[PDB]
C-alpha cells in the first residue's frame, strides 16, 4: 500500500522535498504537492524529536539582553544600573526607613529626550521574511565572501594589507597564477596586474 | 569549590556536567549528593584521609657521588617503604616567580615530606625500584 | 579526485576563513574540518572538496604560497 521513497520520487514533479516519512502518510501525492506548493512554509523541525523544542538549551550561558541603541542613548541604563547597585547595599533598616521617608527625584531625567528617542530617533529593526522559521540552533548558525575580495579578518591572518597597488598587495598566489593561468572554474575572473589593469581594477579582482 | 554550579540568565541554578536545572539555593546542594551527580562524577580516598601528619623535618645527608642522599628516618612500624617522586616547581602553595626547576620529593606517613632542588636537566634517575634501598631495621633510607 | 588535503593549519582558523581563502582559487563545494569534539579543537588539517578534478588539481598547484598565522599552508592530493 505505502509505496516507497523511490516510486514517490518518480511520480512527483519535484522530488526534492519528499522525505522519509511522506510515504507513511495517508495521501502522499497531495502531501508532497503541498510540500512543493509555492510560498508555503514547512513544518517545524521538532515534530519528531524527543526534547520538547527548547530543553536542549540547558547549560549554555547567554548575555542578558542588548537594549536597542535609541533607548541606550537616553541614559536610562546607566541611571538604572547605578540605582540597582545603590539599592543592593541597603539593609532592611534603611529599606523600610526610605519607605516612609522617601527621597524622590532619584532619576527624574526629562521627557523631551524620551519623546525624542521614541519619535525622532526610532530605528527600523532587522526583520525577516515570512518563510524564515526558527529552530533551536538558528542563532548560532551564523556562518551563512566572494572571489576577488578578501575580508579584513582574513587579511590580518594572511598578513596581506588592502591596498590599491595591484602587484605589492596581491595575494601571494599571484606569481603562480601568471605561470599556470587564471582559475579553471572562474572563466570570467579578472585579476589586476594579470588581465585587468593594476591601478584601475583595485578591488583585488572581479567577475566581469 | 564546585566547578559545575552555574547560575543562568534567569536566577536559577544548573549542574553543568549533569545539565540539570534547579529552582532554589537548596536544590542544587541536595543534588550534588545523588545518583545523577555521583555517577557523572565517576565518568568525569580512604588512605588519603587517614594519613597521620605531624610534619617533622627529618635529617638528610646529601653528598656528591661519582662512578646520593642518606635520610635517617625514625620508626614507621608499617610495611610500606618510604617513597620518592620527581615534581616540578610549576605548582606550589604560594605560586611566586622563578618557578622553573625540579624537586626530588621524599615522603613517608607519620612525619614531614622533604624536597631536594635539581637544577641540572639530567644526572640520575628518580625511580623507585631501579635505584632505591630501604634499610628498615636501622631505618636509614636510600636512593641514588 | 575532487578533494584536496590542506595542512599546517593553526587551530584558531575557522571553516569560514578556509572557505573564503579557497574560493579565491576555485568554487568550493564543501569543507570537512576535523574537530576533537571533547576539547572543541581543530586538528591542523582539512579536506576541501572542489566541483571536479581539474579544479582540485589547479588548486594544489597554486596553493603552497600562503601563510596563515605565520604558518605556511600545505595543499596535497588525496
Ligand atoms: Zn550534577
Describe the structure.
This is part of a larger assembly, with chains A (208 residues), B (144 residues) and C (78 residues). Chain A has 208 residues and is mostly helical. Among the domains of chain A are: 1-58, no CATH class; 59-127, no CATH class. Helix content of chain A is 28%, strand content 2%. The two termini of chain A are 55 Å apart. Chain B is α+β, with helices and mostly antiparallel strands. In chain B, 15% of the residues lie in helices and 25% in strands. In chain B, the strands form 3 sheets. In chain B, strands 1-2-3 form a 3-stranded antiparallel sheet. In chain B, strands 4-9-8 form a 3-stranded antiparallel sheet. Chain B has a 3-stranded antiparallel sheet with strand order 5-6-7, with no helix packed on it. Chain B is elongated, with a radius of gyration of 23 Å. The two termini of chain B are 40 Å apart. In chain B, 8% of the residues are buried. Chain C has 78 residues and is of the alpha+beta class. Chain C has helices at residues 15-22, 53-62; strands at residues 3-7, 28-32, 35-36, 41-42, 45-50, 67-68, 71-72, 74-77. In chain C, a hairpin with a 4-residue loop joins strand 3 and strand 4. The longest helix of chain C has 10 residues, at 53-62. Chain C is globular, with a radius of gyration of 12 Å. Chain A binds chain B through residues 58-59, 61-64, and chain B through 6, 8-9, 14, 16, 19-21. The complex binds zinc ion.
Amino acid at each position: 500500500n505505502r509505496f516507497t521513497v523511490a516510486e514517490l520520487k518518480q511520480l512527483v514533479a519535484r522530488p526534492d522535498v519528499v522525505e522519509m516519512h511522506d510515504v507513511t502518510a495517508q495521501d502522499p501525492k497531495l502531501l508532497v504537492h503541498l510540500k512543493a506548493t509555492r510560498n508555503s512554509v514547512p513544518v517545524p523541525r521538532h515534530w519528531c524529536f524527543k526534547r520538547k523544542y527548547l530543553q536542549g538549551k540547558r547549560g549554555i550561558e547567554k548575555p542578558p539582553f542588548e537594549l536597542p541603541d535609541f533607548i541606550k542613548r537616553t541614559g536610562i541604563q546607566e541611571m538604572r544600573e547605578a540605582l540597582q547597585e545603590k539599592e543592593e547595599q541597603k539593609t532592611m533598616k534603611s529599606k523600610m526607613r526610605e519607605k516612609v521617608r522617601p527621597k524622590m527625584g532619584k532619576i527624574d531625567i526629562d521627557y523631551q529626550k524620551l519623546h525624542d528617542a521614541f519619535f525622532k530617533w526610532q530605528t527600523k529593526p532587522k526583520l525577516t521574511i515570512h518563510g524564515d522559521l526558527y529552530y533551536e540552533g538558528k542563532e548560532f548558525e551564523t556562518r551563512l565572501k566572494k572571489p576577488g575580495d578578501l575580508s579584513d579578518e582574513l587579511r590580518i591572518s594572511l598578513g596581506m594589507p588592502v591596498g590599491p597597488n595591484a602587484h605589492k598587495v596581491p595575494p601571494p598566489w599571484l606569481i603562480a597564477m601568471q605561470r599556470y593561468g587564471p582559475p579553471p572554474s572562474y572563466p570570467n575572473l579578472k585579476i589586476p596586474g594579470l588581465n585587468s589593469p593594476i591601478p584601475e581594477s583595485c578591488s583585488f579582482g572581479y567577475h566581469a | 569549590k564546585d566547578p559545575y554550579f552555574m547560575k543562568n540568565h534567569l536566577g536559577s541554578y544548573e549542574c553543568k556536567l549533569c545539565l540539570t536545572l534547579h529552582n532554589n539555593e537548596g536544590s542544587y546542594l541536595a543534588h550534588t549528593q545523588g545518583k545523577k551527580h555521583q555517577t557523572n562524577l565517576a565518568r568525569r580516598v580512604e588512605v588519603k584521609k587517614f594519613v597521620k601528619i605531624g610534619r617533622p623535618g627529618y635529617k638528610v645527608t646529601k653528598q656528591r657521588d661519582s662512578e646520593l642522599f642518606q635520610i635517617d628516618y625514625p620508626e614507621i612500624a608499617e610495611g610500606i617503604m618510604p617513597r620518592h617522586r620527581f615534581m616540578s616547581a610549576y605548582e606550589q602553595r604560594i605560586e611566586p616567580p622563578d618557578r622553573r626547576w625540579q624537586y626530588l620529593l621524599m615522603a613517608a606517613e607519620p612525619y614531614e615530606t622533604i624536597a631536594f632542588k635539581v637544577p641540572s636537566r639530567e644526572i640520575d634517575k628518580a625511580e623507585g625500584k631501579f635505584w632505591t634501598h630501604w634499610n628498615r631495621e636501622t631505618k636509614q633510607f636510600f636512593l641514588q | 579526485d575532487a578533494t584536496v588535503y590542506v595542512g599546517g593549519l593553526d587551530e584558531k582558523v575557522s571553516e569560514p576563513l578556509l572557505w573564503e581563502l579557497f574560493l579565491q582559487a576555485g568554487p568550493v563545494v564543501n569543507t570537512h574540518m576535523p574537530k576533537d569534539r571533547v576539547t572543541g579543537q581543530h586538528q591542523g588539517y582539512g579536506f576541501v572538496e572542489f566541483l571536479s578534478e581539474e579544479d582540485a588539481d589547479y588548486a594544489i598547484k597554486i596553493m603552497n604560497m600562503i601563510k596563515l598565522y605565520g604558518k605556511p599552508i600545505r595543499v596535497n592530493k588525496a
